[PDB]
With several copies, the nearest count.
Chain A
Amino acid sequence: SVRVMQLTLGNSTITTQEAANSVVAYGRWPEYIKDSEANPVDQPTEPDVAACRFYTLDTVTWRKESRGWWWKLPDALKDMGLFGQNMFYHYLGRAGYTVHVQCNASKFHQGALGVFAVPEMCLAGDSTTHMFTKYENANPGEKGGEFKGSFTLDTNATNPARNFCPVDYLFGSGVLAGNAFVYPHQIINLRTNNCATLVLPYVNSLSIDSMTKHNNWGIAILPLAPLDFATESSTEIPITLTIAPMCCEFNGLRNITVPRTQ
């Protein structure tokens, strides 16, 4: 039925008994580069089962006060097994994804989470200096980031944070959040479903790019209807994020990249 599914990729399987169908972004399933759209001339590496499998990133907790969370792809998976290895050993890389967000509660809980997949999800910074966010802050990895309820300008001139300041109702980029529904999405309304499943093809203005310099997709999760339970002002339910890269192919092998951190 629309509600029961099983996803198998490599050596990993995911089962769900409360789905609300699955979304295939823009109606496009991920695919490899065709010869007619090929650019780099060298033989690509395609790890296949070693990289195209389900990786579970860290679990976040939803509370009445949560504003939202965000992650960047392939960034969030840079340290994930052999996918991360191939990402850093190659100059160029390409991949699609199957994003599976998990969140179960009970029949006496309420709340709705909007799960959006955004191509080129550029976020707003914290200073008066334009495009000032530094690489280390823009790429948090598997832990991702969070949305805020208001904009707060960083004034420390001696030691600028050079970080993002994504305000939730402004979708972290100066647009109204209610219009974010034009992007592939699903809603995890506690009275209806457990999860949200989105299949994302590779989207870019090029056939292949640098995975370290460029993040193709952004995953934004916003509480559309806040978490509430029985009468417990105190309520916490975890949100686990499991993502699997698809049709990975890398070009331009050399020595490994070791990016600067923190």
Chain B
Amino acid sequence: LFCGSMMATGKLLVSYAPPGAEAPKSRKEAMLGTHVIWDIGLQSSCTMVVPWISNTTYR
């Protein structure tokens, strides 16, 4: 949820990287995994779904 004023704008990148590689430290690495580019505006919130990507049937 964005709690800035109405006059504030911006675009953010929310990301999810399945295990096994180096944890993303730059937008460049994060953008290679599951991600949602959130544009701020009227709809105040943005949802990113972290899909079930696993080797085992249960964690």
**Residue ranges of A at the interface with B (Cβ–Cβ < 8 Å):** 4, 11-18, 39-42, 54-56, 58, 81, 88, 90-92, 102, 104-112, 187, 189-192, 194-195, 206, 208-210, 212-213, 224-225, 240, 242, 251-258
Contact = CB atoms under 8 A, between A and B. Distances in A.
Contacts of A195: 39
B6 A191 contact: yes
Interface residues of B, number: 45
A252 B46 CA distance: 22
A33 to B, nearest CB: 12
A41 B34 CA distance: 13
Most buried by A among B11, B22, B42, B56: B11
Nearest to B56: A206
Contact of A212 (B20, B40, B41, B44): B20
10 contacts: A12-B34, A91-B21, A92-B18, A92-B53, A102-B37, A104-B40, A106-B8, A208-B55, A254-B34, A255-B21
B35 A12 contact: yes
B1 A91 contact: no
Contacts of B36: 12-15
Given A15-B36, A18-B39, A108 B18 contact: no
Contacts, number: 153
A194 to B, nearest CB: 6
Given A191-B6, A192-B44, A206 B21 contact: no
Interface of B: 1-11, 13, 17-22, 24, 27-44, 46, 51-57
B38 A255 contact: no
Nearest to B33: A254
Given A17-B40, A109-B5, A206 B20 contact: no
B39 A15 contact: yes
Given A92-B53, A208-B55, A253-B32, A191 B3 contact: yes
Given A104-B10, A187-B1, A257 B20 contact: yes
B42 A17 contact: yes
B22 to A, nearest CB: 7
A40 B5 contact: no
Contact of A110 (B5, B13, B21, B53): B5
Contact of A107 (B7, B22, B28, B40): B7
A11 B7 contact: no
Contacts of B43: 4, 17
Nearest to A253: B33
Contacts of B42: 17
A104 B9 contact: yes
B16 to A, nearest CB: 8
A254 B30 CA distance: 8
Contacts of B55: 39, 91-92, 206, 208-210
A19 to B, nearest CB: 9
B34 A255 contact: no
